[PDB]
């Protein structure tokens, strides 16, 4: 069920859209959840 | 005298002018019911709609 190697974050999971929904504010401007912004940062650094 | 029967009430009642106030709390502002209402999207739990 648990291994010491599994503690190291080699692959990072992405919460579903249900966990983090796309809020709508000021019309059709989809206000992404705080998780999305961090996820957007995470992918950018990972690609770099 | 009893309103319903007109018979004298055995005990004599203390009656007179007293100053009363109507408080802002009306029942209509407080009565509220919930039955399969507009749950939230993120939490899937009840919220006011």
């Amino acid at each position: 069920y648990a291994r010491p190697e599994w503690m190291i974050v080699t692959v990072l999971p992405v919460p579903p859209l249900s966990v983090r929904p796309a809020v709508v504010m000021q019309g059709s401007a989809r206000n992404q959840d705080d998780l999305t912004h961090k996820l957007a940062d995470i992918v950018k650094i990972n690609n770099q | 005298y009893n309103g319903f029967t007109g018979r004298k009430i055995t005990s004599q009642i203390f009656i007179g002018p007293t100053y009363y106030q109507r408080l802002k709390h009306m029942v209509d502002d407080k009565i509220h019911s919930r039955a399969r209402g507009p749950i939230q999207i993120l939490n899937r739990q009840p919220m006011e709609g």
């Binding site: - | 399969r36 209402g37 507009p38």
Partner: protein, 252 residues
């Protein structure tokens, strides 16, 4: 998406926040609508430069007490001008001052170039240069100013009665209609009209006083006043109470 009714316009419901087949009754989606929110019931140089200009725009506005809506309009003009970048060489303060002038013109409450200059470190000449450039860059236009666009501010700043303000507006409008002052600046016509109206009422303002608020040299007011003085009785409103008779108005 009624399974029975393909392509049916589901009706939104606020009772539980669900969309129902308009003619079946079936609830498609349990409580998906989210009624409550649906219905009312380390700074980049560009941003830092924009932020400073936004601060400058507000600082200029409060000096002449402009409403926030004009400032909001001015910010939009600055962003459009800043984004388009035809004025990159020009100083941001000059661009903002021109944007403030344009925002006032667009809103129907023009401020003269001198008034904008008084609240800005940028001279009138530079503001005018930026003003024309912004119009070309934005491909926009501003309605031509009229003599009555400054009567309310000028008369109120001079503490002149309302009847005088109406008389001055009538005089200025009539003078332009009669073409008694062809080519004269609307501000000069307004200043002369205010002087003509002021001298005909109990509250009398000297030429210097009218020039200061209007920013027009007394000589220019004197020139315009001399042009409209001959037709003084015609310009004045018919139902105007003359504290000083028109025949005895100052001659100069």
């Amino acid at each position: 998406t009624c399974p029975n009714h393909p392509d049916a316009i589901l009706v939104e419901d606020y009772r539980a926040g669900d969309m129902i087949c308009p003619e079946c009754g079936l609830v498609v989606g349990d409580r998906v609508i989210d009624v409550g929110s649906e219905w009312r019931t380390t700074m980049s140089s560009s941003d830092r430069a924009m932020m400073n200009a936004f601060k400058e725009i507000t600082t200029m506005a409060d000096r002449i007490n402009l409403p926030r809506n004009i400032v909001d309009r001015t910010n939009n003009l600055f962003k459009q001008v800043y984004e388009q970048k035809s004025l990159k060489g020009r100083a941001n303060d000059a661009i903002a001052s021109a944007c403030l002038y344009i925002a006032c013109r667009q809103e129907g409450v023009p401020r003269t170039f001198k008034e904008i200059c008084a609240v800005s470190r940028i001279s009138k000449k530079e503001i005018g240069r930026c003003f024309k450039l912004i119009l070309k860059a934005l491909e926009t236009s501003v309605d031509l100013i009229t003599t009555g666009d400054f009567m309310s501010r000028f008369c109120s700043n001079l503490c002149l009665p309302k009847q005088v303000q109406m008389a001055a507006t009538h005089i200025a409008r009539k003078a332009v209609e009669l073409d008694l002052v062809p080519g004269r600046s609307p501000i000069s016509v307004a200043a002369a009209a205010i002087y003509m109206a002021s001298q005909a009422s109990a509250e009398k303002r000297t030429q210097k006083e009218i020039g200061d608020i209007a920013g027009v040299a007394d000589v220019t007011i004197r020139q315009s006043y001399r042009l409209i003085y001959p037709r003084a009785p015609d310009l004045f409103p018919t139902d105007f109470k003359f504290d000083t008779p028109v025949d005895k108005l100052p001659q100069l």
